[PDB]
């Protein structure tokens with residue numbers, strides 16, 4: 001399949017990303033508290049449900065939440081402010097809480113069942129969110145004596161995610177805080193705006209995009 005792209009809601013950020021976040025790829029977004037990385041996740045979970053003419057992929061979403069940062073009311077607000085039915089939008093986000101790093105890995109393994117079920121339907125899974133990729137690994141694997149095993153498990157988790165992205169034409173979007181991922185770093189800008197910086201992309205130039213966080217989620 002040709003690579004599909006999901007608009008972030010921000011024209012500036014889309015331009016930096018070559019059009020939006022890509023299917024068949026993992027986009028990994030870093031930021032401290034209030035950076036906007038989870039707001040971007042929420043916005044993408046709405047945008048992907050739009051038709052391609054409006055920046056979506058007519059897709060369903062699967063969402064893995066490690067720290068209780070998913071806000072259904074925020075989905076509803078973004079959806080309604082973009083003209084979608086808020087209840088329909090929520091029905092097409094399959095939510096799972098991950099309680100620890102092992103459970104997080106099992107959820108990605110067992111997400112393939114729903115992906116397969118939806119694959120040839122009107123709403124195939126097009127976005128798989130892991131917010132956040134590392135919170136449980138960081139909590140559970142303390143010290144340099146634990147680093148080797150932490151990295152091995154995380155590498156296998158990322159491999160599982162890459163396989164789903166490539167085999168089923170899904171955009172994987174993960175959050176992180178400071179491995180074949182496209183890495184975007186968010187920071188506070190001036191006047192309450194946020195800045196995204198793209199770093200180390202093999203085939204996209206580094207650059208920055210300024211965006212806002214509004215009732216529509218993220219936009220210029």
Ligand SMILES: CCc1nnc(NCc2ccc3[nH]ccc3c2)s1
Nearest residue numbers: 062063064094095096106107110111
């Ligand atoms: C590990 C035990 C399971 N618990 N739930 C499962 N399958 C159902 C399910 C529902 C929504 C989901 N969003 C992301 C993954 C996902 C999965 S398998």
